[PDB]
Design an enzyme around this catalytic site. Sequence first.
Site, PDB file in Angstrom:
ATOM      1  CG  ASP A 162      -2.238   0.709   0.951  1.00  0.00           C
ATOM      2  OD1 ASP A 162      -2.174   1.873   0.507  1.00  0.00           O
ATOM      3  OD2 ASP A 162      -3.318   0.134   1.199  1.00  0.00           O
ATOM      4  CE  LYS A 163       1.433   7.054  -2.579  1.00  0.00           C
ATOM      5  NZ  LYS A 163       1.829   8.208  -1.731  1.00  0.00           N
ATOM      6  CB  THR A 164      -0.571   7.347   2.389  1.00  0.00           C
ATOM      7  OG1 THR A 164      -1.728   6.502   2.364  1.00  0.00           O
ATOM      8  CG2 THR A 164      -0.395   8.006   1.027  1.00  0.00           C
ATOM      9  CG  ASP A 175      -2.182   9.284  -2.940  1.00  0.00           C
ATOM     10  OD1 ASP A 175      -1.573   8.423  -2.272  1.00  0.00           O
ATOM     11  OD2 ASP A 175      -2.777  10.251  -2.421  1.00  0.00           O
ATOM     12  CG  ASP A 213      -2.344   2.883   8.418  1.00  0.00           C
ATOM     13  OD1 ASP A 213      -1.709   2.356   9.356  1.00  0.00           O
ATOM     14  OD2 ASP A 213      -2.560   4.111   8.349  1.00  0.00           O
ATOM     15  NE  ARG A 271      -1.358  14.589   1.228  1.00  0.00           N
ATOM     16  CZ  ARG A 271      -2.634  14.806   1.520  1.00  0.00           C
ATOM     17  NH1 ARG A 271      -3.590  14.631   0.622  1.00  0.00           N
ATOM     18  NH2 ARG A 271      -2.959  15.202   2.747  1.00  0.00           N
TER      19      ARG A 271
END
Length: 1127
Positions: free
Chosen positions: A484-486, A717, A826, A649
């Site tokens: 995943d990301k973030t 995103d 997360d 961002r």
Amino acid sequence: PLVDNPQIKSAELLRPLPLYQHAYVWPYVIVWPVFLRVYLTQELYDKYIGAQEWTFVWIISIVTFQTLTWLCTHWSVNLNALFTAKKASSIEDAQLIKVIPVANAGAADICKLVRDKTNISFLFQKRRFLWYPERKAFSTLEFDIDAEPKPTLSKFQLSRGIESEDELKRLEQHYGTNTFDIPVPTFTELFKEHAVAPFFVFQVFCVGLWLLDEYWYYSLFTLVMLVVFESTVVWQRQRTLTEFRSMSIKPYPIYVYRLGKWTEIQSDKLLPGDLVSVTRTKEDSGVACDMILVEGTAIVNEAMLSGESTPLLKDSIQLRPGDAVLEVDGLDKNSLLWGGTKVLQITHGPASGIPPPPDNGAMAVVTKTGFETSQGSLVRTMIYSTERVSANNTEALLFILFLLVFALAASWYVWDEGVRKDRKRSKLLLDCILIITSVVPPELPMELSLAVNTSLSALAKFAIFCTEPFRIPFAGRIDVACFDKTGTLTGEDLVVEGIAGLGLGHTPKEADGAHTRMVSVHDAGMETTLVLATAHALVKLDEGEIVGDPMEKATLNALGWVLGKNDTLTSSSGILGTVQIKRRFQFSSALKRQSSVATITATEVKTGRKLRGSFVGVKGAPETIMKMLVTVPEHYEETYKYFTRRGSRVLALAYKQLTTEGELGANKINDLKRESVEADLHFAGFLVLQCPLKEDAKQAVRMLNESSHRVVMITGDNPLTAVHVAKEVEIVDRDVLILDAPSLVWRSVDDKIRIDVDPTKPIDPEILKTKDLCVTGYALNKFKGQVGWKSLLRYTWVYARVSPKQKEDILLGLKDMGYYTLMAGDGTNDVGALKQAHVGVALLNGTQEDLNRIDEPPTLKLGDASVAAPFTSKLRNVMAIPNILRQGRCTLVATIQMYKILALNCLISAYSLSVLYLEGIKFGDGQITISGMLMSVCFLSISRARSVEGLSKERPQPNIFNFYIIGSILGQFAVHVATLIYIAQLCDQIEPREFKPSLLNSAVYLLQLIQQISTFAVNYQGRPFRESLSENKGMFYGIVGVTAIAFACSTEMLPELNEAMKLVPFNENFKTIMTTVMIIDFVACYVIEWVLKKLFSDLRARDIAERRPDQLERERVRKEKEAREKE
């Protein structure tokens, strides 16, 4: 009756039968008087022999058949349903039901029906099922929040609780009490459960069989060793059950609006539909059951469900459209209070027209009670974590049956040679049965559980906890490791770069015309400062802490303003004003914007310019505000694209004034639609943020890519940020092409290549060959089910802008091709995706210093496991994934080595007994006892091994039946049997032919001891995965000592030790031959095992994980540079 549950395979209806008609009673009642008549008076000795030993044999055989037919009911459920019960007609007369779960859900069991009035129910794995006559099938309980049509908010906003007593009684009979029912039995019931398992009774039968042949010490030793192990296992299970019971929540008084009165009742009698009052929880307490807030707001701390201690914010459904809005758990996720959380604060003290509760707390509505809550399901699935012992043993039984053929061949040869030499038939049969029964390994089918419980201890040292421990072998077969990301690759220490693009419509530029001039947040306009101070969702605790998203905290810290008592901000910046937030619209993750309405009063210190009155501030994605502006600037698109192409961002800021002077009024602000407010906006600027990469991301991805895995990324995103992060983390290497709507055209990052493709036609092979791919969510949605969807999951590694449903869609599509997947997230945004994958990891946010100030692993308390994913790491490092992938890789290696050792030991023992019994002599008692003790010592000494500090390109085999285990076993067994045959023939050539010592006995005993040590020395899995044999002293000294002892007994270094094992002294030449034969046997076994390991051990990587020669060369030169820089 074809129950409706994804976790159950089949069902059947049965009726009980009386004890007279049981299958283990009536045939023996028929046949026993026949035997008594034959033995007493009939004298029909044609089908008989005559001796007392044969009477003993007949009695033992009959009793063995009877008790075997009885125990077959306890061993399996199908024979229980066949021998004891019988099938019924339908639901009208059946009293029993048979439930067979899915392949990894536990063990099948006969469940008893209980009838209450009309309602038919049974309990399976502590979960209640109900019989619905309108559907003609069984299914779980149905709650008001989980209906097939989702109820609207008018169901809950105008709810009045329970109004009638008969309704209360009906709910009490239907749903039951709100408590955890964990019954703990005593030692007697657990030992009764353990004493009917097939291997325990088989070992008891073997002990009795050995005791029948005048072996007094060996049987006692075996019995003691079995009994103490069973007692230890039972005591450990009892302690675990007690600890599981100890975590139940204690009842406490609560207020429930029942029958028009705020009556105080205990928290053990909650029912779905009650109107309960929520107040601040006390010490060692929590929310009783799942709820939904109907009035007021609360600040909770869900540390017992997600393992994170950060406070959250929950809001009511008071100010939503009652009937025009269907309830959705993606937008109203901030209104459900889960069972187990702790309420930290209540802000306020109605549409239903209910007087307030006396305790001045928030009102909620109960939804689920009992095991049907979230933490109830977690407790239930942690109770039955032993699915590795029950829903298993389908290959070890085949291995035992495979060894039984080699047993039967030798036993049949012994019997055939004994019947032609006129032996006593009362002893030859016992010898044959001993040869048969000396083969089955008693600890073979439960090796995987011991390996898993050993790996779980090593995993629990890096703060990694596992809830479902049958996924550890799945971690050694991973081919695709999704990321995943973030929440996983990039941290949360955001820094505000500044405000850029605010000079549009009023100057450095580039070829596309973007405005690269950037202004710090301090020297900004007044309207932009008001928007930044208005459009957040931060609330302050009474003790002084600020809770919320770290983005809002970062922008508030960069702004410089301070937070007041009740949504008031005052003021370093040069604005010198104050704001007060009236109404807040929340972020929805589908509208991609958030808005707020506030009252402002500002006075700029530079040019005056007073401004006061109502104000509307909205902050969201730049591609959504552009649809809400009135006049877009000249270079809006180019500026935001340029500022987002470098991994930053970008968020847009817009403002609108409602009244230039004076309040709007409470009634007006309390009744405003979201669509009317979010229109006719102005423009302020862009907010630029940089998310810094985690310190361990590059190394923990470069280890995964170069160890026969494949790393893909599934983010949410815009594609440019995803491509930039994937290029920084080194996931993609060549030029990428973004597939997105401009039609589903191919786009480049710099937007110089625009190739259109039609979804019906297959994609171009050159695009698949010479370029990397980045497939968005819309394009993947338009490719659903067509011919190109199979080749868009094998050549793409960056999925950007996908909904949480599309994540599990992609995971299911990858699983259906035969690959094994891993998902690391997360734990909050995606929940179904973490469970769809084969193994799921939920990376939390705790640091090492937080852990510093604060055998199976320690039993999982409620603060250790997470309800989202099976695995859980309390450290934020990305390095937690290679540790799991290494432990799940060492587990398979340990299992393979134990499988290879035990079968060789059993086949050596059986063919030693078969060689000895052809001459009529037999082993001594002390000799076999010493041999067993030495083998147990070697088993204890060999088990202490640890793993290497890195992953390897070689993958281990996942199953028993391959060309490596079988070939090595056959080769070593052939070498050993040829050695034993030659030694026996030579001993017969030297000396021609109650226990007495002899040459053959001593020679065979020494040879079998040496072979049983050599099979430990040779079959140790070493270098690539675990530590080598020569590295550790613990097993090297243990092997060397027993080898030296055996050799010294062979060559008579210490003649005093010879008389302990009753060995006849040898001469010189026989000693020389014995030593030479021993050395030849060891060398041949080592050579055969090394050749087969070098040839057939490696399981090659799949087609998806194979690298191009350029990447191999880059890896080689990087490793060379690291080796050079090591010194």
